[PDB]
Structure formats: C-alpha cells, structure tokens
Amino acid sequence: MADEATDAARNNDGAYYLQTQFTNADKVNEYLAQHDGEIRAEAAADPAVVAAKAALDAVEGGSHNYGEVKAAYEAAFNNAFNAVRNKYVQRFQATYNNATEQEGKTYIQGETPEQANARYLKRVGAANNQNPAAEDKGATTPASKEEAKKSEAAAKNAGKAAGKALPKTSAVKHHHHHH
C-alpha cells in the first residue's frame, strides 16, 4: 500500500505563455481537449513516466531518493504531455492551413511557446518496468479529531463580617431634685 493519490484537478486557465487564451489558442485547446485521452495515455505510457511512477511506489513517503524520483516523475510527466500535445497541434495546424500556406509542408518547423518552458524538463533516468499504483481509500477531508472541552473555576473572594460595639452605661442618679 505504498501509494496514495489525491486526484483534485484544475479545470482553470493555465497557459505558461498565453497566461489566459491569447492569440488563437482557443482552437488549440479545443483539439488538446477533444483528444485529451490519447494525449494523456501517450504521456502516461512514456518509458520515463511509467518507470518513474513504478520507482516512486518503491521509494515513496519521503524515502531519501524520493525527492529525486518525485522531481523526475513530475519533469517527465509534464515533458511527455507537452511533447505529445505539441506534436499533434503542430501537425493539425500545418494541415488545417490549406488555403495558401503550410499545406503538405513536410519541410518546415513551427515551434510552440510552451515548448520554451517544456525544454527545461527532460529526464529519463529510469525506463522500462510498469506496474499499477492507485489505492487511496478516497480520503475526502477526514474531520477525524474534532473536540473542545474546558472546565475551569476561580475567585473565592473571602470577605469579613462585622466589628463590635457596646451600649452606654447609666452612671447617673436622679437630676439633683431640690426642694
């Protein structure tokens, strides 16, 4: 069970270069979306990615070389997914330019903007070797451990009661009384 995968997703604008949808990138995304399956499968079937995941399941948690295989797995994944998506959109546009240009063009490049980012990521320092890795028991926010007891007291004050007094005596007898 040395595997755990919180798939949480990001259906949001994520252009490393357009930073939204600049230029005619809508028709790009439309294709990259329409074939997101074949693209994802190719990227996930790349020798670097299969090997890196299968090595991760053998070194996970933070086990030492973990940081390396983690960085390699990421690098190779993004690398591969970029490379497949790139090669397709490049073919697609340099076919669906039929009108004046790039029709039949076997002999000219195009490059892409994400390609300048993706160039940085290339590692294939393990290959071959593919076994399965997904079983995370869901783990959909466990509000385990939630309580707040408290039980306090204070302030006994400890006042006093009273003083003492006495009535006067009657050290008088008559009030003269002459005749």
Care to describe what's here?
This protein has 179 residues and is mainly alpha-helical. It has a domain at 18-133. Helices cover 35% and strands 0% of the residues. It has 5 helices and no strands. It has helices spanning 25-34, 36-44, 47-56, 66-93, 113-118. Helix 2 runs antiparallel to helix 4 and helix 3 (47-56) runs antiparallel to helix 4. The N and C termini lie far apart (126 Å). Pfam families: AbpA-like (PF22224). GO terms for molecular function: nucleic acid binding. This is Amylase-binding protein AbpA. Residues 134-153 have a biased composition (Basic and acidic residues). Residues 127-173 are annotated as: Disordered.
Topology, please?
Blueprint: H1 25-34, H2 36-44, H3 47-56, H4 66-93, H5 113-118
Helix pairs in contact: 2-4, 3-4
Report a brief summary of the structure.
This protein has 179 residues and is an all-alpha fold. Helix content is 35%, strand content 0%. The protein has a domain at 18-133.
